[PDB]
């Protein structure tokens, strides 16, 4: 019997089979009901006649009925499996409450009748995907950014940092600044294009000011882009200005500190002991960390932030968009992991609190 790895995100569901090198299903974490309900991409196209909702906010599940619907659709329509024949690894946000996590367990067992499940912290899986059990994870997704410092495979809860700004915000901002340029991107259809420009053409500048200086001088940083109506459009300084929001959340009117600073502050909240280890083990995770240049930029910013003698390293795996899912695939496939599943039997005996004595 194969295991299913199912990574729930604010914006995207990543789901598939343990042992695969990537998720078979990737789709909007969206439920739509009329103004008898619809999931993912169907929900989006039919948004004119539905109330679209997000069951996961900032990585935390907040609407249980819609989450149930998401999972149903995942098992039955996306992966086309019988959930009662498959151990299921689910993933969770950092600092997910005990009540939440227990509720996930109950639903799997009572609603979906799985024979076994597990719940693993997403940052741990990412860090595990990179062959590490110690380090600090920057997980930037669609709806939230976390810094998660992990030591010997255990996340340090007092040092976790949250920044309420990620992918969907960068998309909205890119819409906004392209519209300043002279285009118009206001409509949902137009949001999807901006999303595609963003993932294709954006990048983090090594020195921000210096980049504006180059961009206000020549075409050397401009790129063309062809639209779905056939129109070609020039995009210039908007390429590095959009992802710069990650370092300067004040660009979208946010008081919060940037990702370099939140990373730094996270490490600062840890033992001197292990602070040295975290610095040489910054691992970047999630769709929003995909920008070219992101590695070097973070590299630089931590260097100027941290003691001058300190050795610092940033790890950006090519596949880090699904590296949480991948970590799950490796984990759920291991010889030794097989003893860690919470079986339906163990659940009937213990109840949902059993879920907490995990290692991941
Ligand atoms: N090449 C890319 N460059 C920049 N952003 C990207 C790229 N590919 C995907 N993204 C963005 O990453 C986000 C989705 O990533 P991910 O699945 O890691 O987040 P999530 O798990 O859905 O949300 P969260 O982690 O906040 O709950 C989307 O906003 C998407 O636009
Ligand atoms: Ca995520």
Swiss-Prot record:
Q: Which residues carry this modification: ADP-ribosylarginine?
A: 162
Name the Pfam families for this protein.
Answer: Actin
Give the catalysed reaction(s), semicolon-separated. ATP + H2O = ADP + phosphate + H(+)
Cellular component, GO, one term: striated muscle thin filament
Q: Which GO terms describe its molecular function?
A: actin monomer binding; ATP binding; calcium ion binding; calcium-dependent protein binding; cytoskeletal motor activator activity; hydrolase activity; identical protein binding; magnesium ion binding
Which residue ranges are recorded for the region named Interaction with alpha-actinin?
A: 95-108, 343-355
- UniProt cross-references to InterPro entries, sorted A to Z: Actin (IPR004000), Actin/actin-like_CS (IPR020902), Actin_CS (IPR004001), ATPase_NBD (IPR043129)
Where in or outside the cell it occurs: the entry states: Cytoplasm, Cytoskeleton
Highest taxon of the lineage: Eukaryota
Q: What class of enzyme is it?
A: hydrolase
Question: Which residues does the record list as N6-malonyllysine (modified residue)?
Answer: 46
Q: Which residues carry this modification: N6-methyllysine?
A: 69
- What EC number(s) are associated with this protein in UniProt? 3.6.4.-
Provide the GO biological process annotations. Answer: actin filament bundle assembly; actin filament polymerization; mesenchyme migration; positive regulation of gene expression; skeletal muscle fiber development; skeletal muscle thin filament assembly
How does it get modified after it is made? Answer: MICAL1 and MICAL2 produce the (R)-S-oxide form. The (R)-S-oxide form is reverted by MSRB1 and MSRB2, which promotes actin repolymerization. Can be mono-ADP-ribosylated on Arg-162 by SpvB of Salmonella spp. This modification blocks subsequent polymerization and leads to cell death.
Task: Alphabetically list the UniProt keywords.
Answer: Acetylation, ADP-ribosylation, ATP-binding, Cytoplasm, Cytoskeleton, Hydrolase, Methylation, Muscle protein, Nucleotide-binding, Oxidation
SUPFAM superfamilies on file: Actin-like ATPase domain (SSF53067)
Do the record's keywords include Hydrolase? Answer: yes
Primary location recorded for the protein, binned into one broad class: cytoplasm
Q: Where are residues bearing Tele-methylhistidine located in the sequence? A: 58
Miscellaneous information on this protein: In vertebrates 3 main groups of actin isoforms, alpha, beta and gamma have been identified. The alpha actins are found in muscle tissues and are a major constituent of the contractile apparatus. The beta and gamma actins coexist in most cell types as components of the cytoskeleton and as mediators of internal cell motility.
Query: Its quaternary structure?
Result: Polymerization of globular actin (G-actin) leads to a structural filament (F-actin) in the form of a two-stranded helix. Each actin can bind to 4 others. Interacts with alpha-actinin. Identified in a complex composed of ACTA1, COBL, GSN and TMSB4X. Interacts with TTID. Interacts (via its C-terminus) with USP25.
Record function comment: Actins are highly conserved proteins that are involved in various types of cell motility and are ubiquitously expressed in all eukaryotic cells.
Spell out the protein name for this chain: Actin, alpha skeletal muscle
């Amino acid at each position: 019997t194969t295991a299913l790895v199912c990574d729930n995100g604010s914006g995207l569901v990543k789901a598939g089979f343990a042992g695969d090198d990537a998720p078979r299903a990737v789709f909007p974490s969206i439920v739509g009901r009329p103004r008898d309900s619809y999931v993912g991409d169907e929900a989006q196209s039919k948004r004119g006649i539905l109330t679209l909702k997000y069951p996961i906010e900032h990585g935390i599940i907040t609407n249980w009925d819609d989450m149930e619907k998401i999972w149903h659709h995942t098992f039955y329509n996306e992966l086309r499996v019988a959930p009662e024949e498959h151990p299921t690894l689910l993933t969770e946000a950092p600092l997910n409450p005990k009540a939440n996590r227990e509720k996930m367990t109950q639903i799997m067992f009572e609603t979906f009748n799985v024979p076994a499940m597990y719940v693993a912290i997403q940052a741990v899986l990412s860090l595990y995907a990179s062959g590490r059990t110690t380090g600090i994870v920057l997980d930037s997704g669609d709806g939230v950014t976390h810094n998660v410092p992990i030591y010997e495979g255990y996340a340090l809860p007092h040092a976790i940092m949250r920044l309420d700004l990620a992918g969907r915000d960068l998309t909205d901002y890119l819409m906004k600044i392209l519209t300043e340029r002279g285009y118009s991107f206001v409509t949902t259809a137009e949001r999807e294009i901006v999303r595609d420009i963003k993932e294709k053409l954006c990048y983090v500048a090594l020195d921000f000011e210096n980049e504006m200086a180059t961009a206000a001088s020549s075409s050397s940083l401009e790129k063309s882009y062809e639209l779905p109506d056939g129109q070609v459009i020039t995009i210039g300084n908007e390429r590095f200005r959009c992802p710069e929001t990650l370092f300067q959340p004040s660009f979208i009117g946010m008081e919060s500190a940037g990702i370099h600073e939140t990373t730094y502050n996270s490490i600062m909240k840890c033992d001197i002991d292990i602070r040295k280890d975290l610095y040489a083990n910054n691992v970047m995770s999630g769709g929003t960390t995909m920008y070219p240049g992101i590695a070097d930029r973070m590299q630089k910013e931590i260097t100027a932030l941290a003691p001058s003698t300190m050795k610092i390293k940033i790890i950006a795996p090519p596949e880090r968009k699904y590296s949480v899912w991948i970590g799950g695939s490796i984990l759920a496939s291991l010889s030794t992991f097989q003893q860690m599943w919470i079986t339906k039997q163990e659940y009937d005996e213990a109840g949902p609190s059993i879920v907490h004595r995990k290692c991941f």
